[PDB]
Amino acid sequence: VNSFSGYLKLTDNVYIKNADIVEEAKKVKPTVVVNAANVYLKHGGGVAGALNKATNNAMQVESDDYIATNGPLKVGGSCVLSGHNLAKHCLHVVGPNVNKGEDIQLLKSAYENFNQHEVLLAPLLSAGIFGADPIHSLRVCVDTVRTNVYLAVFDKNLYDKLVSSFL
């Protein structure tokens, strides 16, 4: 049993809810929250800007030190950093940004990072301002992630479309 409430079960391991990932993290304090990161860990907007704002910019301060030491992530890659006030850990995952021309095939590689964690609270990778089709992102998630993933979908309209079109 775990703390996640109000989710619709899509598969053995994938659950979905209409919710702002920030408010969900604040309530649940999951072991792992996933950030929709870029390779520079510049948390300006979208999910990343919202998570970072909720940490009072502590996520950005920690991320800048990580990049100064290690250099940029790979598209499809990840790093584990603090979850600050939102979670034990934040798994920063870089999905391909369609609005930058990145290979959508890298979306599967991005979701593979989730398999290193038994349970996660996450957004749909490469959705929102990253430009991918969220229906596609959900299909890749279900076909790639084998650990237990609780997906928070910000837009109520999109949530209803994801559920009603799910195969």
Ligand X SMILES: O=C(O)CCc1nc2ccccc2[nH]1
Residues 36-75 that bind ligand X (CB under 6 A): 46-47, 50, 53
Q: What distance in Å separates the CA atoms of residue 41 and residue 51, rounded to the nearest whole number?
A: 12
Binding of ligand X by 150 (CB under 6 A)? no
Q: Are 27 and 4 in contact (CB under 8 A)?
A: no
Q: Does 21 bind ligand X (CB under 6 A)?
A: yes
Between 50 and 149, CB nearer to ligand X: 50
State which residue, 22 or 107, has the beta carbon closest to ligand X: 22
Pairwise CA distance, residues 61 & 44, whole Å: 13
Give the nearer residue to ligand X in terms of CB position, either 20 or 62: 20
Q: Which of 100, 146 has the CB closer to ligand X?
A: 100
Query: Hey, which bits of the chain come out as E strands?
Result: 8-9, 14-18, 32-36, 78-82, 89-93, 119-122, 148-153
20 in contact with ligand X (CB under 6 A): yes
The Cα 138–Cα 87 span in angstroms is 23
By the rule CB under 6 A, 22 interacts with ligand X = yes
Q: In the block, which residue shows the tokens 């030190």?
A: 65
Which residues are near ligand X by CB under 6 A? 20-22, 46-47, 50, 53, 128, 154
